[PDB]
Design an enzyme around this catalytic site. Sequence first.
Site, mmCIF file in Angstrom:
data_model
loop_
_atom_site.group_PDB
_atom_site.id
_atom_site.type_symbol
_atom_site.label_atom_id
_atom_site.label_comp_id
_atom_site.label_asym_id
_atom_site.label_seq_id
_atom_site.Cartn_x
_atom_site.Cartn_y
_atom_site.Cartn_z
ATOM 1 N N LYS A 21 -24.425 -15.158 -71.759
ATOM 2 C CA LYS A 21 -25.631 -15.595 -72.477
ATOM 3 C C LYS A 21 -25.796 -14.914 -73.799
ATOM 4 O O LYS A 21 -26.048 -15.577 -74.801
ATOM 5 C CB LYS A 21 -26.897 -15.360 -71.665
ATOM 6 N N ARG A 91 -34.068 -12.098 -70.412
ATOM 7 C CA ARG A 91 -33.073 -12.795 -69.604
ATOM 8 C C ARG A 91 -31.752 -12.036 -69.395
ATOM 9 O O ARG A 91 -31.031 -11.734 -70.343
ATOM 10 C CB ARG A 91 -32.817 -14.164 -70.250
ATOM 11 N N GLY A 100 -27.874 -19.451 -61.186
ATOM 12 C CA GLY A 100 -28.767 -19.393 -60.059
ATOM 13 C C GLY A 100 -28.955 -17.996 -59.533
ATOM 14 O O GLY A 100 -29.767 -17.772 -58.651
ATOM 15 N N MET A 102 -29.206 -15.101 -61.817
ATOM 16 C CA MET A 102 -29.739 -14.189 -62.787
ATOM 17 C C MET A 102 -31.247 -14.250 -62.956
ATOM 18 O O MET A 102 -31.937 -15.030 -62.291
ATOM 19 C CB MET A 102 -29.001 -14.383 -64.122
ATOM 20 N N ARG A 336 -23.616 -22.687 -72.341
ATOM 21 C CA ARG A 336 -22.522 -22.005 -71.670
ATOM 22 C C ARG A 336 -21.584 -23.094 -71.194
ATOM 23 O O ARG A 336 -22.044 -24.196 -70.925
ATOM 24 C CB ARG A 336 -23.061 -21.226 -70.458
ATOM 25 N N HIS A 454 -32.231 -24.843 -58.069
ATOM 26 C CA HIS A 454 -31.347 -23.810 -57.636
ATOM 27 C C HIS A 454 -30.201 -24.329 -56.733
ATOM 28 O O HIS A 454 -29.009 -24.061 -57.007
ATOM 29 C CB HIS A 454 -32.143 -22.708 -56.949
ATOM 30 N N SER A 763 11.247 -13.234 -48.002
ATOM 31 C CA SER A 763 9.982 -13.933 -48.029
ATOM 32 C C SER A 763 8.927 -12.831 -47.781
ATOM 33 O O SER A 763 9.005 -12.056 -46.809
ATOM 34 C CB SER A 763 9.863 -14.995 -46.961
ATOM 35 N N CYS A 830 4.546 -16.088 -48.208
ATOM 36 C CA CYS A 830 4.006 -17.117 -47.292
ATOM 37 C C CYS A 830 2.835 -16.619 -46.447
ATOM 38 O O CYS A 830 2.354 -17.326 -45.590
ATOM 39 C CB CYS A 830 5.107 -17.639 -46.356
ATOM 40 N N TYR A 850 8.977 -18.391 -55.910
ATOM 41 C CA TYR A 850 8.083 -19.427 -55.484
ATOM 42 C C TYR A 850 6.993 -18.891 -54.583
ATOM 43 O O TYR A 850 7.094 -17.799 -54.063
ATOM 44 C CB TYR A 850 8.911 -20.496 -54.776
HETATM 45 O O1 LIG Z 1 1.975 -13.069 -43.872
HETATM 46 C C1 LIG Z 1 2.839 -12.866 -42.932
HETATM 47 O O2 LIG Z 1 3.184 -11.739 -42.603
HETATM 48 C C2 LIG Z 1 3.385 -14.127 -42.261
HETATM 49 O O3 LIG Z 1 4.281 -13.883 -41.330
HETATM 50 C C3 LIG Z 1 3.072 -15.433 -42.459
HETATM 51 P P1 LIG Z 1 1.922 -15.861 -40.934
HETATM 52 O O4 LIG Z 1 1.221 -14.620 -40.653
HETATM 53 O O5 LIG Z 1 0.983 -17.015 -41.394
HETATM 54 O O6 LIG Z 1 2.780 -16.365 -39.846
#
Ligand SMILES: O=C(O)C(=O)CP(=O)(O)O
EC number: 2.7.9.1
Lengths: 872, 872
Positions: A21, A91, A100, A102, A336, A454, A763, A830, A850
Site C-alpha cells: 500500500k 492504514r 481482508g 489488514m 494493488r 470480507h 530420486s 517425488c 525433473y
Molecule cells: O518422499 C519420500 O520419501 C517418498 O518415498 C515418496 P512417498 O513417501 O510418497 O512414497
Amino acid sequence: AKWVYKFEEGNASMRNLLGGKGCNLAEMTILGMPIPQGFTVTTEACTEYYNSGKQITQEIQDQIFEAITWLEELNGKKFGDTEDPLLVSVRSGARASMPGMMDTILNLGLNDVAVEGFAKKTGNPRFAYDSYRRFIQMYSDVVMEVPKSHFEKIIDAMKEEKGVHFDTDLTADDLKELAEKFKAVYKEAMNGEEFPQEPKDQLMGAVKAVFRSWDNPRAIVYRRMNDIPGDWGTAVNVQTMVFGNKGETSGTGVAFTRNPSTGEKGIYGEYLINAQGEDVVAGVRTPQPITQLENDMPDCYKQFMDLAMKLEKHFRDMQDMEFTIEEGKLYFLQTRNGKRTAPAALQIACDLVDEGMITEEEAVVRIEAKSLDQLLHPTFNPAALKAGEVIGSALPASPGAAAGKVYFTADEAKAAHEKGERVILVRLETSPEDIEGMHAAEGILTVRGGMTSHAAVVARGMGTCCVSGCGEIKINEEAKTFELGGHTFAEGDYISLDGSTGKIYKGDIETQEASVSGSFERIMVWADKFRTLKVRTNADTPEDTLNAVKLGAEGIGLCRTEHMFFEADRIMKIRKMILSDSVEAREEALNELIPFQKGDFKAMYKALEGRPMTVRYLDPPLHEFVPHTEEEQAELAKNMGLTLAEVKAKVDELHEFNPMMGHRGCRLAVTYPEIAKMQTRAVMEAAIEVKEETGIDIVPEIMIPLVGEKKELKFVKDVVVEVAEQVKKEKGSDMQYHIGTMIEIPRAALTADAIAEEAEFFSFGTNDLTQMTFGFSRDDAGKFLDSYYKAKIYESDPFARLDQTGVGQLVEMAVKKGRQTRPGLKCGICGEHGGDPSSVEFCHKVGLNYVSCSPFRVPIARLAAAQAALNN
Amino acid sequence: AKWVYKFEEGNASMRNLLGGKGCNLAEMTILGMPIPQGFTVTTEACTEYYNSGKQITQEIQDQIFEAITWLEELNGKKFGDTEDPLLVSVRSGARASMPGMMDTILNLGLNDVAVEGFAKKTGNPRFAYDSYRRFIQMYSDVVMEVPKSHFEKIIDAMKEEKGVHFDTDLTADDLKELAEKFKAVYKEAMNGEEFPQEPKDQLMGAVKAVFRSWDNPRAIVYRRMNDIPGDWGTAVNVQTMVFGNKGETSGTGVAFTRNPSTGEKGIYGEYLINAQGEDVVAGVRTPQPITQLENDMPDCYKQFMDLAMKLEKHFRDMQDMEFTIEEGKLYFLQTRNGKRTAPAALQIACDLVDEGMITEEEAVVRIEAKSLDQLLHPTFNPAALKAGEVIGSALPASPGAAAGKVYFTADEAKAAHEKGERVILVRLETSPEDIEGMHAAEGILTVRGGMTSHAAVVARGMGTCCVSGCGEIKINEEAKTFELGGHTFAEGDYISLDGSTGKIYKGDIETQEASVSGSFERIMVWADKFRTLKVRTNADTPEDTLNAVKLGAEGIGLCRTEHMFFEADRIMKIRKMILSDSVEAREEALNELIPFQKGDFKAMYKALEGRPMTVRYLDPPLHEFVPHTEEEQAELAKNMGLTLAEVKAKVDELHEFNPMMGHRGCRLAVTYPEIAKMQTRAVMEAAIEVKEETGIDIVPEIMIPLVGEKKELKFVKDVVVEVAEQVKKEKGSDMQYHIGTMIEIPRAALTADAIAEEAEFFSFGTNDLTQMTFGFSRDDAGKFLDSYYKAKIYESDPFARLDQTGVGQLVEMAVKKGRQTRPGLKCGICGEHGGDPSSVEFCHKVGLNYVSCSPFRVPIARLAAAQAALNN
Ligand SMILES: O=C(O)C(=O)CP(=O)(O)O
Ligand SMILES: O=C(O)C(=O)CP(=O)(O)O
Ligand SMILES: [Mg+2]
Ligand SMILES: [Mg+2]
C-alpha cells in the site's frame, strides 16, 4: 534515523520498506493522481518496534509527529485542532498484500471538541458526528478489540426506536447521541479509561496497534497459509482524509479493472453514495455495481474509468482500486495488483499478452503457481445440479462447486473439518478472526456483503467457493440454525453452493472432474517453453498415468509397488512368503506373484507408450503384510496349516518399536534378495513383452528405497542385474534398463558420490528425507507442530514446503557429490515437495533434472518449473 | 491432346489436372523418393470421357498405350508379356481426397500365360498365383461389381478344407486352383464372358471403370456430404507394381506422421508382412501397429521414418502415407495431407506452429471449419460410463461417445435414423456402399479391421465414433443379431461405444456437454485475430446466450419472440386477443402480456451485459396461436364465454391455403399495430430497467420480419418509434434504439435502397429468402430434393448451404443497394446458412458486418470468418 517517508519520497520499488500500500500510494502520487497526501511509517520501524521490547522508540515518535507537521502545513489545518481539524486515516500494509487481514481507521483526530469545530467548519453537523461515531467504533475495534458487535448493537437499537430504516436516516442529534453511547463502550470495556481525546495519543495508539497486530495469532496463521515470512513486518500509512459521507454527491467504492473471479476484461466492483469504506464492505445498504455509478455521476465515472485504465497500463496488470468521491471530486486511495482465482489469472495474463501490454515471460512469471490447484477442483455434475433444489440465490463472489455440512462459527467449521467432514461456513459476514475456519470450508455462505465483502475477497484468495449477500437468510447463532426458502437448516445439514451462479442448494450435489480452460493450455505452452525441468508424475495406476500425461506429465517419477502385494488377490502370496522357513519356500511363494505383477506393469507400460517410469521397489517392513486381527491371523493359520499361535509368534517377531526406521526397503531386500529378484522379473518380463507387442522402446528404471550406503545398494543392484540379464536372455532382448536409488536417508546424501558409483539415477524421497533430517515422523508431529506454528518456531510446514535451509542442504549436496562420480547423473524428486512451487524452484536451482508430483499437481510444477527458469 | 502425364511431368500444383494422388506421386517423384514410376490420365480426360457419350476417345487410348510403352522401356519389361510381364496398379484419385471412396486394382497385366512367365521369372509360383488371384478379385470388384463376398466365400472354402488357418498357408497349387475358381466367378456373372486375358483390355477396362464410377450413386451422395463439385472428375494413376506379398521380407502399410484421432505427434498406423494393401484394410490377419515394424525390419523402419518426416516437413502438414517393402526395399506409393478429427486438426496445427513449421495464418486456414461441430458432440457422463456394463473391447478408430439402437445394414440404419432413432451400425466391415448409413449412425462397430480399415478412416472423416476390429463379435446377418460377451443382441437394442477407449457397452449410456480443448481456444484467438466479421448468436434464452457467449458469440443476431406468446402462461392472452372484436379489446388482451415479456427481455439483457441483441418481432400468422383440437377449442370457448362454434369460425377464418406466405410478420403488424406496440413496450421497458439497475448501456435492436416494401416497414416503424419514445418519456430515459428489418422477401433485396431509408440495419433471414427465391417450402421439398440430389440437379442442399449463384445475388444486391441510401448500414445473416463455412465466406465477401448462428456453431463461424478474411 529515517523511519518515515512522505508519499512523494518513495516509489513502487521501495515496497519492502513502504509495504505494498505504501509503495503504491507513493507510485500513484508520482504519477500525479488525485491521491490525498500522507506519509508512511516503514516496515523497518516495525522491526525496530519489535527490537525495543514492543515499544515505539522515542525517535520514531518524533518522526511521526514531524511528518504530521508536514501534513498540517500542506493542508493549512492543525491535526485534530479544536477549530478546523485535520483528520487522517491510518492504514496498515506489509510488503506482501493480505486482502481482508489488514487494518483501517478513518477520521482519526476527532474528539469531543474537534468534532464541533468540524461541524462548524463544514456547516454540516450530521456529517461531523457521523464521522466521529465511525472513528470511535473503528478505533475501539482496531486498537483494542471491542467487537464491532457492541456498536452495531447500539446503532440498531437507536434506528429501531427512532423508527428508522437506515443509518443514513439519522439526525445529527442522534449521531451526537450515538457518539456518546459509543464512547461509553470503549470506556465500559477499558478499566474505566475513556476514549483518547488527544489526536497525538490517537495516532500513536493506532500505530502501535498495527505493529502489535502483526503478531496476532490470526496474522501468524494467515502468513503461513500464504508463505509470507514473519520478519517482513508491516508499514503504517497515514493520509489526509477525503470523505464519501459528506452527502449525496459523495461516495466510496472498490473496483477491479477486470473480473477477479473469471478474468473477463472490464470494470468490476461496487460502491455506495454517502458512505465510508466500511459500509460497502459490510453491505447493510446493498452495494451498487460499479457500472451504475455512470448513472449517478457520469463525470466522476468518466474520470474514474480513465484513471483506472491508466493504473492498469502503468502497473501492466489488473488493478484492485479504492476511491472516494467527495462532494463531486474523485480521489484514489489505493491500488494493488488484484488478487484473483486461477481461471482469472490465466484468462487475464492471456488478454494482457494479446493486447501487447506484457510479454509471455511476464505473463507466466506473474501467475501464482499454487493457485492452479483450483483448476482441478471438481465442478458440479450438470444432471445433479439441474435436479438440485435451489433454495436461495445471491452474489457469486468466488467460483467453485462447494458441498458440505454447515457450521456457524469458523472454529466449529475448522474442527468439523479436522474430523474429515466437508464443511460450509454460514455467517452474517466473516472477519479476520474466521480465517482458519474459512480455510477449512468447502464454501462460504454469507448473509450480507457483496463482491468486495470480507468473505468474497478472502475466498477469491483461497480459491474457495463463496456466495455472499444472501439477504434472505435468517441466522440463529444461538440455536445454530438458519432459515432459507423452504426450510430451517440445523448444524451439520448438507447444502451446496455454486460460486459461479450464486445459487444455493438443499443437500449434497454430485460433482465430477474439472476440464481445462484454454489460456490454461496456453500458459502451459508458454510454461513448457521456458521451463528446463521436466515434470513427471507420482502415479501407481494406468488411470492416474493418463490423467497425469493428459496434464503434461512427461512420464513417471514414482510408481509405488506396495499395492501389487497388498491387494486381495496378492496378500496371501506375501503372507505365505512371510510364514515360510525356507529361502526356497520364500521364492516359491514370491514367484506366485509374478503373473499378477507382470500384469500390473504391462498395463502401465501400455498406458505409458515409451515415457519413462521410475519403479520403486518394496518399501514397507514385513509386519505390514501380516494380519493384525486375531481372527484374520486365525484364518491365515488355517490357510497355511499352522496354529494360530505360530502365526501370532511370527507377527510378534516382525513387530518393531519404530516401523519408520526398521527392517524395510533396501535392508529388507538385503536379507531377502528374493523379493527384489521377483519384482525384477515382473518388471522386465512386462517391459520386453509390451515392447515386443508395440515396438515402442522401454527403458525400465528400477529404484531401491531407503538406501544409506554404497555397498548396501550394490548388494541389491547385483541381485536385480542378474535377474534382469537372465530375463533378457530368456526372451532374446537387447533392452536397456537403469538401476538407481532413492535418496532419502541423510547418509545417502552425505555420501552420494559413493552411492553414485552404483546408482544410475537418484530420486529424492523428501517425505523420508525430511522426517530423518528433522528427526520426527509426520504422523506424530501433529501434537506439537501447531504449537510450533503458533509460536513462530516454524513458518512453514516442512512436509508440505521443502525446508531449503536444512533438508535443502542435503538435496544440493547429494546432487553435487553424485555428479562428481557420475556427471550425467539424472536427479528427480517425488516426496510431496515435488509439487510445491518454492520447493520446485529450489530443485531447479540445485540442478535436479525433473520434479515429480501427483497427476492433478502437474500443472503447478510445470508452471512452477517455468517460473523457476525465468526467475533464475 | 495431352491427356496423360508422367509422374516426372507434374507437381503438387497441377492437382486439378492430376488429382490429389496424381499430383502427390508427381511431387514425391520430384523429391527423388523411392516412388515406383507411372503416369496419370488427367481429370480432363474424365470430362472428355463424359463429353463423348461415356466412352474413351480414340486419342486418349492412344496416349494411355503410349505411356505404357514409356513404362515398358523404363522397366525393360513388356506390359503383361507372357514371359517377363510388367504389372501395374491402377488407382483413381480426384482433386479432392475421398478416403475410402476411391478405387485400387493391383497386379493388373496378369493372365493365364503372363502369370507362368511371372512365376518363372521370380522363381516363386506361390507368389505369382497369389497376385493373379488378387487381381481377378479386385478387377471383378472394381470394374464390374462382383461382391468381394463371392470371392471371400471361395477362399474360405478352400482354407476350411485344406485344413488351413490363414491365406498365407496356401500352396501355389491351391492359388493356381483358386485363380481358376475366381475366374469362374467373373465369368459365372458376366453373360458367360471370360475374364479379360489381354493386358490392354484390362487396362482400358479399369480406366473406363474409374470414370464410370465417378457417377456412381454412392460417389454422388458422398460428394454432397463433402461439398465436392461433381464436374471435377477423377484422374487415373497407373504405376509399375511393387509387391509386399513376395515373402517374409516383404510387406505393406499405411501410416500417419501424427495421430489422426487425437493429433498427438508421432507415427501412427499399421502394416502386414507378406501382404498387399487389401489385407491391411481388411484386417483378417490382425494388423500390426506401425511402431512394431522397427522390430521386424529396423532398417526399412529407419528409412521409412526419415522419409515420413521429410514428407511432413515438405508438405508442411501431417501426412497420411502408404508404403510397400519388397524383399527388404522400401517404396512409397502415396502421401496426402491426412484427414483427421477436429480435436486432431487443432492439436496438430498448434504443434506445427510451435515448431516453426507453419504460421498461425497457415494453421487457421488449414483446419476444416465444418469439423468443429465435432468439438461439441456430447461426451459421456463419467458416472454413467463407470457404472456401464462393458461387454467387449477393440480399436478406438475414431473418437466420440455414441449410443444408439443397432442395425446390420447401412440402409436399415439410415432408414431407422430417418424415423428419429439414434443408430449404431454393426458390420463385419464397411464399404463405399455403406456410406450414407454410416453418415446416419451415432457410431460404427466393426468385427474386423483396424486403424486404417474402411470404417475407421471414413468415420474419422465424418467425425463419427467407431470401434473397429472387435473380433469377439459374431454377426448374424441372416437373423439380424450378434453375440458379444454376455449376450446376443437383436436389431434395435441399445449399445454405446467410446471411440476414445475402444470400449463397448450394453445399453444406452448417459452423456453431457463437451468441454473445450486448449488449441481450440488458441485457434479461436488466432481466428478472432484475422477475422473481420463479427459473430453473433441465434439465441432465444439466457442459457443459450451464455453458452453462445461462452464460445465467442459477440451478442445476438436473432432473438425469436414467438415462445413469449406460445408458452403456457402466455397463450391465452393472444387467444383472447385473437377472439376479441375490438381494437380496444385487442389492446387489453395484448397488454396483459407485457409483464411476462418484459420479464423475458430483462433476463436476456441481464445475461447480455451490453452485447447487442437483434429482437425479432412476431413472425407467425394468427392461426398458429388458436387451438386446432376441437376439445382445446371447446375450453377456449368456455374461458371466453363463447360458443364452441364461434371459436371454430374464428379458427376457420384465420385458416390459410399457404401459411408460409399468408397474413404474418409485418403484414400482421400492419393490420394489428397493437402487437408491435406491445412488443415494443416490453422491449424498451426491459432495457431501460436493466439499464437503470446495472448502469450497463443497452441499445435495443428491433427487427421487423417479412418485409418487402419501404412504406410497409415505415408504417410499422412509426408505430414502434411512437411507443419507444413514449416509454422513454415515462422513465426519463435517453436510451438509444435502432429499428431495422429482415431481408427475407426477394422484393426487399431488390428494393433494398428504398428499404434502407427506414431500416437502420438489415438481417438476412435466409431460410425464407431461400424458400422464396427457389419457390418452395423446406417442409414439402423433401419429396423431390432427393431425386434432385440423385440426378445431380443440385449438388448442395439450399437450406443448409447458401445458394451463392441465385439467392446469393439477392443478398449481395441488398447490401449494395442498402448502402447507397445508408452507407453505414449494418448487415447480418441469421437463417441457417450463418453457420455454414462457405456461406459465411460469401457473407464476408459481400460485405456483411456479421453472421449469426446457433450457440454450438459459433466456433465454426468464428473459424469460418477468419478463413474468409485470410483467404480473401
Ligand atoms: O518422499 C519420500 O520419501 C517418498 O518415498 C515418496 P512417498 O513417501 O510418497 O512414497
Ligand atoms: O432465415 C430466416 O428467414 C429466419 O427468419 C431465421 P429462422 O427461420 O431460424 O427463424
Ligand atoms: Mg520414502
Ligand atoms: Mg424468416
